[PDB]
């Protein structure tokens, strides 16, 4: 899991939005109690989730199974990228790094400084602050970026929220967060 602070890239009403899991989560309703955590299922709008295909390395879109809401109990490791991107995980959560010419899944507490993550590097063009715009898919709609980022700094930090999220969708434990940081079990 990641802190609610973790930004998740999704698609809402055919519009890609990058919003924290605590924010993304809100696009959902119907919360159930299970596994000693909370599970929210069924979006109140058209909510899709941007995920990555490990095998091909492409950014795909899928439907959501539910929202992963769990009481912030453990602490989280933070990864700071050379670009200034940073993401956190419950340390037990595997991180997807691109080393040895392959993609490997290592726990946050198993990841080391100077490690990499896969970034889809594919933006939605409109990086405007807040949800001011939405019905815009103009400006061609074709990006271009092929580069992965190394972790400049890792640290042990504490969960910002009292709940942590990951957003459960198809393929499971595979989502694009922060500045498109890809992770998978």
């Amino acid at each position: 899991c990641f802190p609610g602070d973790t930004r998740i890239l999704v698609q809402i009403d055919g519009v890609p939005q990058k919003i924290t899991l605590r924010e993304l989560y809100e696009l959902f309703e119907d919360e159930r109690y299970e596994n000693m955590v909370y599970v929210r299922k069924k979006p109140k709008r058209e909510i899709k989730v941007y995920s990555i295909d490990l095998e091909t390395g492409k950014v795909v879109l899928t439907d959501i199974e539910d929202v992963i809401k769990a009481p912030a109990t453990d602490h989280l490791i933070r990864f700071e990228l050379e670009d200034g991107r940073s993401f956190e995980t419950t340390v037990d959560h595997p991180v997807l790094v691109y080393e040895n010419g392959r993609f490997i899944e290592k726990r946050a507490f198993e990841v080391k400084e100077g490690d990499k993550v896969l970034v889809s590097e594919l933006e939605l063009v409109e990086q405007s602050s807040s949800s001011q715009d939405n019905p815009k898919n103009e400006n061609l709609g074709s990006p271009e970026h092929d580069q992965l980022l190394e972790i400049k700094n890792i640290k042990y930090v504490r969960a910002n929220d009292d709940f942590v999220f990951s957003l459960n969708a198809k393929k499971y434990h595979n989502v694009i967060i922060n500045e498109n940081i890809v992770t998978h079990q």
Side-chain angles (χ1 to χ4, degrees):
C1 300
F2 324 96
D5 171 276
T6 292
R7 307 202 291 252
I8 177 169
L9 205 303
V10 294
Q11 182 172 94
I12 290 146
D13 277 271
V15 183
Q17 303 189 31
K18 173 153 52 182
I19 45 171
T20 81
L21 287 164
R22 66 201 305 277
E23 290 181 308
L24 177 259
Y25 147 87
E26 308 186 83
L27 281 280
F28 296 97
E29 240 188 85
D30 210 81
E31 179 178 293
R32 80 176 186 232
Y33 192 29
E34 189 177 59
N35 286 207
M36 312 192 183
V37 302
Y38 293 99
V39 202
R40 187 163 293 223
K41 23 75 71 184
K42 187 279 179 298
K44 319 175 299 123
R45 304 187 182 180
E46 184 63 276
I47 279 95
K48 307 301 193 211
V49 63
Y50 277 89
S51 191
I52 281 266
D53 191 63
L54 298 73
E55 21 174 302
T56 63
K58 292 148 172 59
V59 53
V60 294
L61 184 79
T62 185
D63 288 83
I64 295 72
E65 297 302 318
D66 63 82
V67 190
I68 305 167
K69 181 178 180 179
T73 314
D74 298 276
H75 303 113
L76 320 170
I77 288 189
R78 160 208 176 102
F79 307 99
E80 179 178 296
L81 290 286
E82 98 167 298
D83 181 78
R85 338 178 182 221
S86 52
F87 69 116
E88 293 161 69
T89 27
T90 359
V91 339
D92 177 79
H93 190 272
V95 189
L96 196 64
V97 47
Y98 175 65
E99 69 164 271
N100 286 327
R102 63 179 292 171
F103 306 110
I104 52 171
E105 317 93 62
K106 38 173 79 163
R107 312 290 178 140
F109 88 93
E110 173 174 50
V111 177
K112 290 147 288 177
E113 227 168 75
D115 237 292
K116 275 214 172 65
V117 270
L118 219 169
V119 273
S120 180
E121 289 296 83
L122 188 143
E123 278 283 270
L124 348 162
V125 180
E126 294 292 86
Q127 62 175 331
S128 308
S129 310
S130 187
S131 47
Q132 189 190 332
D133 216 315
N134 182 271
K136 186 186 304 179
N137 179 215
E138 303 301 289
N139 205 272
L140 182 62
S142 306
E144 56 171 74
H145 239 221
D146 186 61
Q147 53 171 31
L148 303 197
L149 222 308
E150 271 171 75
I151 302 169
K152 277 306 194 173
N153 180 269
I154 297 178
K155 62 167 64 186
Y156 272 91
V157 272
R158 167 181 295 218
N160 171 85
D161 299 80
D162 294 86
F163 293 91
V164 284
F165 303 88
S166 297
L167 200 284
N168 192 35
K170 305 200 67 176
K171 191 180 300 301
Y172 303 88
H173 281 135
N174 188 334
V175 81
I176 298 174
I177 58 167
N178 197 264
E179 297 307 82
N180 296 31
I181 301 174
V182 183
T183 173
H184 178 62
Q185 184 174 329

